[model samples]
Target: GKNTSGDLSQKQALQLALSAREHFWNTMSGHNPKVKKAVCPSGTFEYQNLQYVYMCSDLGTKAKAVNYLTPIFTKTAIEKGFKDYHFTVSKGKLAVPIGDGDNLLNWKKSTAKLISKKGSTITYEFTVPTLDGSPSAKRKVTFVKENKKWKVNQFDAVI
Candidate 1:
């Protein structure tokens, strides 16, 4: 088993992200009491990046789901709450820790279109889906290399 805190290659990080998103959405696909009790259906996703990661870690761990979503979060996000964590998401599926706007009950693997990269930043288009698995729109998520690993620096899902 890999260590919880370990160096991640760029490719490994991206793959982990892809797998984590899929795993998160799939977990929220079925009848989930935790998700149902989330803050608000539409206003839940407006949480801080760290908050989202923390939530995912909690949920995925509690459920014992096989996915990297739990570990992909920054260590500070896990310990603290939204304190400059080097990660962010375009949307939230279950709960909104910081009262973000427009949350989703379900999520599907959105398409990621590569845009450009420079130094430690990776710019790409991240498509988000609706609860019914429909293409919501293509948003952009910028990743930055931090602490010898790539982290989600910015995510914006303009509806």
Candidate 2:
């Protein structure tokens, strides 16, 4: 057979694939939307590509690590019309919260993003449209990581 699916061992293929996957996850560490559903559920969570995020608490971050978004934060964003949410590694997914372009009117029109790395560190950013035909601005948040997870400990506003 000139064109056939043979010669390669299934076990060998899978092992190679998994090894490649681990490399991918390791490379994508620290990117935004850092967490995703774990494919095997063996303790590692999958993210961009074949990378797996381990549930580690020794990174100096504090607070109890929540598997997903905080309940309180989710509710607030949804109620405030924070739609069009998308997370991906290949696309224009910003590594961290940054400022959006300015608009002509309104103030703080865009939704603010919140992030907590641990007990002593927290960061957030939001877009603020001009109140009157001016330009848009932004707000920034900052905090420190403590214990083993991220926690909301500080906040700041940036223009």
Candidate 3:
């Protein structure tokens, strides 16, 4: 049989990427898919903080880290970068700068655009607004396919 590796079109690939991100955020917040919230769950697992919910998960608990990042970043990279996602929020401040126009929950309310693609790589663009509703500059999110599935490689906006 011939290999079917090249069958995914750029559009299909991007849609999957968007779906992956959405699903990850959805579960991390643990909200009903039908009734979305603008304010995301705070970044803690047990007494979880609102900053590191998905970048990394509790190793001792049943909860899992966002595996999508596994394919996207090297184990070495994840080791080095895992603790860095916490900076996105301050003391009771926004986690991702989207909800209520100033926090992470706003991701569902925002849209992502595919800016470019070449071979197995694609870039997605989106924005999160800061306090006072000042939108952050557009980010070129990069995704690469590994083992026939798309995973995020880079989104400078994200830690």
Candidate 4:
């Protein structure tokens, strides 16, 4: 285990979340495996969760982590409108630049304080960036820690 620890504060966690998109997009691994083992119910879960856990904590196995989650975003999920996911977790969400061709994928905690505990629930807010020239709206995501992993138990992006 190298550079792995679960006791990291929310600040460090969100800080690591800043590079989520580049981490995933840069990899040759598919997004399907990233969605299954997700805490909530989408690939978005794996995107943030894995970036925080696998990369930061160094606890989870990289290959297995991806394997357990790919099917979550398979054809079935897409058929049900679960194609892609993005999250904004804090009091106010970031306003992704418009037509700037900048997919500045970043996640920041709205509150300057840590909102997580070993075995409790916390609520947060965020805004998912819009592609295809669409309007962006507010979003809410709930985080929970079980055993030693962080999960986005529930969330919604309202346009």
Q: Identify the candidate with maximal lDDT.
A: 3
TM-score of 4: 0.30
lDDT of the candidates, in the order given: 0.41, 0.31, 0.43, 0.32
Which segments of candidate 1 are over 4 A away from where they belong? 1-102, 105-107, 133-135, 154-159
The sequence of per-residue lDDT tens digits that candidate 3 reaches over residues 13-132 is: 445545645544443343325333334443543224332331222221212333433644433334344344332333433223222212333443445655776787666676644444
Please say which candidate is ahead in TM-score: 1 or 2.
1
Backbone clash numbers for all candidates listed: 4, 22, 12, 9
Instruction: Give the poorly placed runs of model 3, Cα more than 4 Å off.
Output: 1-58, 61-77, 83-105, 129-132, 135-137, 155-159
lDDT tens per residue, model 4, 1-159: 235334545454343233332333322222224344433211222333333111211102333323332322222222222123321222221111111124432334232234334535554445544554455434454445544554444211111
Per-residue accuracy of model 1 over 78-126 as CA lDDT, tens digit each: 3332223322334433332332233452323445556676666666665
How are the candidates ranked when ordered by TM-score, highest leading?
3, 1, 4, 2
List of clashing residue pairs for candidate 1: 42-102, 42-103, 46-100, 46-101
Q: Highest TM-score among the candidates is held by which one?
A: 3
RMSD of each predicted structure? 11.6, 22.1, 9.6, 15.4
Whole-model lDDT, candidate 3?
A: 0.43
Better of 1 and 3 by lDDT: 3
